[PDB]
Amino acid sequence: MKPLSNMKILTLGKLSQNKDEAKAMIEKLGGKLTGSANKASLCISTKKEVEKMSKKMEEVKAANVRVVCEDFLQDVSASAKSLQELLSAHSLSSWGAEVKHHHHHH
Numbered sequence: 001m002k003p004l005s006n007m008k009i010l011t012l013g014k015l016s017q018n019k020d021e022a023k024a025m026i027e028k029l030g031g032k033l034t035g036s037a038n039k040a041s042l043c044i045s046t047k048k049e050v051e052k053m054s055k056k057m058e059e060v061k062a063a064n065v066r067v068v069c070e071d072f073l074q075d076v077s078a079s080a081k082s083l084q085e086l087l088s089a090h091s092l093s094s095w096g097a098e099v100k101h102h103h104h105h106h
Contacts, residue, residue: 003076003083005030010040012056013049015070025073037063044070047092066096 009031015022026033034040037059045067050057060067072090075081 001029003029007041008032008034008039009042009044010034011044012060013045015044015046017070038065040065042066042068044068050092061095064095064097066091067093
């Protein structure tokens with residue numbers, strides 16, 4: 001039971017899991033709640049939140065953090081498939097440190 005224990009988490013806006021249901025379940029896996037943006041690994045947000053494209057969303061986007069649905073937590077909690085496979089479909093965003101060792105600067 002170490003799905004989120006190897007990564008930090010951030011949640012923006014209301015999600016399916018409640019206050020006492022999100023915080024408790026996220027910490028139970030090993031997941032942690034960050035206060036910054038880029039420090040986080042996968043941000044928890046729904047497509048509806050993304051459609052709005054609020055100022056906060058811009059921060060996440062400019063922070064280079066991938067966005068995934070909250071049901072992700074339920075998926076790892078219940079199912080135990082591949083990490084890559086889960087974010088392959090659940091991921092609502094295609095950004096988030098796409099390159100870890102590539103020189104695109106000039």
